[PDB]
């Protein structure tokens, strides 16, 4: 007659218990679907990224309107070079053919808990940039961010 | 009818965000294509090369017109011998068959952050010189710059 | 457009002060 | 039938004895549960804290209603700087941008048995203050209280 479709929460399944009650809240557990990247520890939490991005802008004294153009070069620089640079060093982003130097102290010192996890936010755009140039000319990099 | 060509910046791709806004400036990110050697940390930045080249010319007291001929010998000397020489030593470049001695103190002391990265500028011409002689006589070297 | 070149004397840097003046 | 549950006070366990009787009072020993911080010697006893707090308020001649606002600055000052300051010195707490100086003689002289143990009372709020600011801006300190 009717085909028995099995349920996801079987009756004979041990929900965790504490003093009789259940520690879980299995009516909204099914209505709880976060993205695999927004609850992963491989990326720094948005609060810690809002601090690194704000503690770097103050060290450079760059205005909020001129701030984002700097972050284009920072990712591109972090593509050839790894996310473990010299804290007593500088990174370069060009105004055409002229090199512009930026200190690496606020970048590494203010990145918590690790510069790798702070730079992991740029991972989505890093692939979108490497592949975009590979169409024109080879851009086989040395490290990643 | 029309074939759907995919875009590089997909709609469902996580641009990094800070307080709602976007840290990147993805309208000039695509119009930003620097050379892989001018934003790499394996070579000293042009400002630091403009300092080493100017702090060495003063120690030798060599005029700006006689200065570049010295740099021919320095690279050739740095081909057989590595970029980590004795600071209390000399390097040689010939006026034909007669040896001419130059101190190695301004070369190593004034090279920041490392003599290897300062000498990495000569990498393009180093290959163009080794291969040019290999046509005439073997020039299998011992180190590089 | 234009690359922001940082200055040596940042605005948020504590110049020594004496009775208001520097 | 019935599962034998073991007792905490086993019959074959040597209660300390003195002249036949028992030195312990093992009927209220089980009904005696103090906090691990209120019987620990790492913090000065409340009687000695009631003396230091009262012997400092008299030296500053500060009223009891204006007294507690001073203790906010004292802990914050004791976060960057350790609990072993110069007795012939002063500590600072701001009325906005204007420094206010307070002598360090009543703070150190009247703290028994050690200023570290007297300042150990503020340990619970010290973490609650460092973490609260770390959300806004980095507050990586140098010592603790």
Residue numbers in the entry:
A (entry chain Aa), B (entry chain Ab), D (entry chain Ai): 42 to 186
C (entry chain Ah): 42 to 63
Q: Please, what does the article write about this entry?
A:
Potyviral CP plays a role in virtually every step of the viral infection cycle, from transmission of the virion by aphids, virus assembly and disassembly, regulation of genome amplification, protein translation, to cell-to-cell and long-distance movement. CP consists of a highly conserved globular core flanked by two large extended regions with a high frequency of structural disorder. The C-terminal high intrinsic disorder region (C-IDR) is partially conserved and packaged in the lumen of the virion, supported by the helical ssRNA scaffold. Here, we show that we can control the shape, size, RNA encapsidation ability, symmetry, stability and surface functionalization of nanoparticles through structure-based design of CP from potato virus Y (PVY).
Because we found that 19 C-terminal residues of this construct, including those of the α7-helix, were not defined by cryo-EM density, we prepared another deletion mutant, CPΔC79, excluding these residues. The VLPΔC79:h filaments had a similar structure to VLPΔC60:h, but a better-defined C-terminal part. The disrupted RNA-binding cleft in CPΔC60/CPΔC79 thus lost the ability to bind RNA, and consequently the RNA-binding loop S125-G130 adopted the conformation found in the RNA-free filaments VLPh and in VLPr. On the other hand, the fold of the N-IDR in CPΔC60/CPΔC79 resembled that found in RNA-encapsidating filaments, consistent with the CP-CP distances along the VLPΔC79:h filament being closer to VLPh+RNA than to VLPh. Thus, disruption of the RNA-binding cleft by large truncation of the C-terminal part of CP prevents RNA binding and also leads to the formation of monomorphic VLPs. VLPΔC79:h filaments are compact flexible hollow nanotubes with an inner channel diameter of 5.4 nm, with thermal stability higher than that of wild type VLPs and comparable to that of PVY virions.
